[PDB]
Amino acid sequence: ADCAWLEAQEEEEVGFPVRPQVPLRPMTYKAALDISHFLKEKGGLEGLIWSQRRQEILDLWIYHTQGYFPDWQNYTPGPGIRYPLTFGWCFKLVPVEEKEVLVWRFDSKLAFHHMARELHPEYY
Amino acid sequence: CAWLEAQEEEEVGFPVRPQVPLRPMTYKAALDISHFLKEKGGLEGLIWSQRRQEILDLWIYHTQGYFPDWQNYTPGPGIRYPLTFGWCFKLVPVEKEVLVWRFDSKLAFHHMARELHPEYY
Ligand SMILES: CCCCCCCCO[C@@H]1O[C@H](CO)[C@@H](O)[C@H](O)[C@H]1O
């Protein structure tokens, strides 16, 4: 089922149901900063249990509204706290009580400290 | 049912609440959306799935405010007919069988789901 989703969205990328209304960019620091702070104030990620599908609904909402390619929202590997690889995005996945139940949590410090970078230089 | 519990939880109000106010699906709304999707969209020819229908349902729910409880079809086997009158897409088999979204403008004037299955009304 995991692989079946990738092939579906890449077919869907031209186009489904409508191609996005705005010019189609890649995710920036400031965009990711504004969208996070937006989603806290108005809208509701805070607390929700993470899933492959929910992330996709969130990725597609940003893609259709703002035009940012859904290529961006990636976190560090487990176990434990799951840090965003795209700097600017102020959400991380915390466990709640080796795969485990995660939760989107806002953290304004993520704006100033690229914690994924500091813990895993591997990726850069 | 693993999806429905997640979907219900989400309904207040992930990822944002839809911007235009909520209202139930109508004949004309369904008609207009269908004819929009054929001209300026890409629902045509695409293989159906549970997730693809949900992406479509949520795009409508967010864009236009229609609660996603309207785009259901008749049971199989064979040509799968829309229960909501106005919606001009049906799911045709390609040859549990592989279905494809197909625009049919005659669905606007004949409630084929009604004529074949009066049990649902
Ligand atoms: C799976 C999620 C599908 C995408 C849902 C969000 C798409 C909404 O899209 C936006 O809707 C606004 C009104 O709400 C309009 O003003 C914008 O022009 C439009 O881009």
Residue numbers in the entry:
A (entry chain A): 53 to 149, 177 to 203
B (entry chain B): 55 to 149, 178 to 203
From the reporting publication:
The nef genes of human and simian immunodeficiency viruses (HIV-1, HIV-2, and SIV) encode accessory proteins of 27–35 kDa critical for viral pathogenesis. At the molecular level, Nef enhances viral infectivity and replication by stimulating multiple host cell signal transduction pathways. Nef also hijacks endocytic trafficking pathways to induce downregulation of viral receptors, including CD4 and chemokine receptors, and prevent cell-surface display of MHC-I in complex with HIV-1 antigens. The folded core domain exhibits the highest degree of sequence and structural conservation among Nef proteins.
The Nef protein used in this study is derived from the HIV-1 B-clade isolate SF2, and consists of residues 51–205 (numbering is based on the crystal structure of Nef NL4-3). The crystal structure of Nef (51–205) was determined at 3.2 Å, with six Nef molecules forming three identical homodimers in the asymmetric unit. The core domain consists of two anti-parallel α-helices (αA and αB), four central anti-parallel β-strands and a short C-terminal helix (αC). Notably, we observed one additional α-helix formed by residues 54–66 (designated helix α0), which is connected to the PXXP motif by residues 67-GFPVR-71. Helix α0 packs against helix αB and is connected to helix αA by a long loop containing the PXXP motif, so as to form an α0-αB-αA helix array. The total buried surface area between the two Nef monomers is about 2000 Å2, with helices α0, αA and αB from each Nef monomer involved in dimerization. Nef (51–205) helix B residues I109, L112, W113, H116, and the methyl group of T117 from both Nef monomers interact to create a hydrophobic pocket. The hydrophobic tail of βOG inserts into the hydrophobic pocket formed by the side chains of I109, L112, W113 and H116. In the Nef (51–205) dimer, the presence of βOG stabilizes a fairly compact and symmetrical dimer, with tight nearly parallel juxtaposition of the αB helices around the βOG molecule. However, when the experiment was repeated in the presence of the same concentration of βOG used for the crystallization studies (0.1%), the Nef peak shifted to a lower retention volume, consistent with dimer formation.
